[PDB]
Amino acid sequence: DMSHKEFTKFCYEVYNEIKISDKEFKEKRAALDTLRLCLKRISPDAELVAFGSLESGLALKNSDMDLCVLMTIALQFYEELIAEGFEGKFLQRARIPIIKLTSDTKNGFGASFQCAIGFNNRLAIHNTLLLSSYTKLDARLKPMVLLVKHWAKRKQINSPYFGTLSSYGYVLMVLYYLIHVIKPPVFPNLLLSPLKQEKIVDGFDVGFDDKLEDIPPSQNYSSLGSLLHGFFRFYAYKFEPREKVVTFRRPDGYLTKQEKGWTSRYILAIEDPFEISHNVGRTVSSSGLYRIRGEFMAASRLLNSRSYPIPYDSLFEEA
Ligand SMILES: O=c1ccn([C@@H]2O[C@H](COP(=O)(O)NP(=O)(O)OP(=O)(O)O)[C@@H](O)[C@H]2O)c(=O)[nH]1
Ligand SMILES: [Br-]
Ligand SMILES: [Br-]
Ligand SMILES: [Mg+2]
DSSP: OOTTHHHHHHHHHHHHHHBOOHHHHHHHHHHHHHHHHHHHTTOTTOEEEEESHHHHTOOBSSOOEEEEEEOOOHHHHHHHHHHTTEEEEEOTTOSSOOEEEEEESSSSSOTTOOEEEEESOHHHHHHHHHHHHHHHHOTTHHHHHHHHHHHHHHTTOOOGGGTSOOHHHHHHHHHHIIIIISSSOSSOOSSSOTTOOOOEETTEEOOOOOOGGGSOOOSOOOOHHHHHHHHHHIIIIIOOTTTBOBOSSSTTOOOBHHHHTOOOOOSSOBBOSSSTTOBTTTTOOHHHHHHHHHHHHHHHHHHTOOSSSOOGGGGGSOO
16 A cells, blocks of 8 residues: 555654653653552552553653542542642542642652542443553554544644543544444454453443454555545545444444434534443534534545645644
8 A cells, every 4th residue: 555655654753753752651650650559558458550541552742641549548548649749639529539640749750740540430441451452453553543632632622621522532533433434444343243252340341352362463454644544534524423423332333323312412422332321522512523523624635635745744733
């Protein structure tokens, strides 16, 4: 596949600039070690588990950590963290308690050290396991994801709290495209594999075909650049967000908002692969979607240009 040779070259150049460095990765691992030691001061029966992009390998540089305490202990842990020189925020008695660390004054992790600690979020640990497996299955997934996250941040469409979509939402859009849209598929659907076994956690089935050594290499040989152009075009022109649901629970990837009962927030519908009652795109407003769609079209138009050379830089320019 030489169709997108120059764009692919550019993609890997940007990828190497935005990916988390080994230095920063080690630092975050070290911060996790320190925080785990602190938790074990509170309880021998509590464990501290990393999840999210750091754990899956899908992290951009200067990333925040997402951690999870598995067993409240929340208050005791928080007060102990403060005593040990961390700065942070916590609201006691919240239905979803969260400790947000914002600074470290003693343990050398930095003035701008940022870490979110939740409690018993087992589903997030499992969806991280799923994303980790996919990143191990194909070497094109990691740079594709970083580049989509970078683009989403640069174009201001990566703000759930302000009407657009979470980074996790974008990763699911990427996986859906690579499993159920592109032909030949880049990836099989591990949840729907005949070898998958049910595994019930917090009332949902988190099972998937996880024996990766038995999964053959992809029969899709497209370049990274070809994959990304295809991804942008699908969501710009082909996907029908008014009627359709991004889903990992159908063999053909076909699911309507009607069948799902997600009609009256469901402006963009992305069904979490495990917690199927959760719409990952619940944060997306009518204005947010129009802006999201507008950016997908702009990305597609850029890459479909018949001129030479194409100014690929504009893909990651702000606004
Ligand atoms: O709807 C959601 C969102 C997030 N998560 C879980 O939280 C993890 C992180 O979600 P995330 O959207 O924050 N990804 P992140 O890499 O931190 O980028 P960003 O915050 O924009 O800088 C995800 O990888 C999931 O494990 C969910 O389980 N459900
Ligand atoms: Br993510
Ligand atoms: Br198309
Ligand atoms: Mg979560």
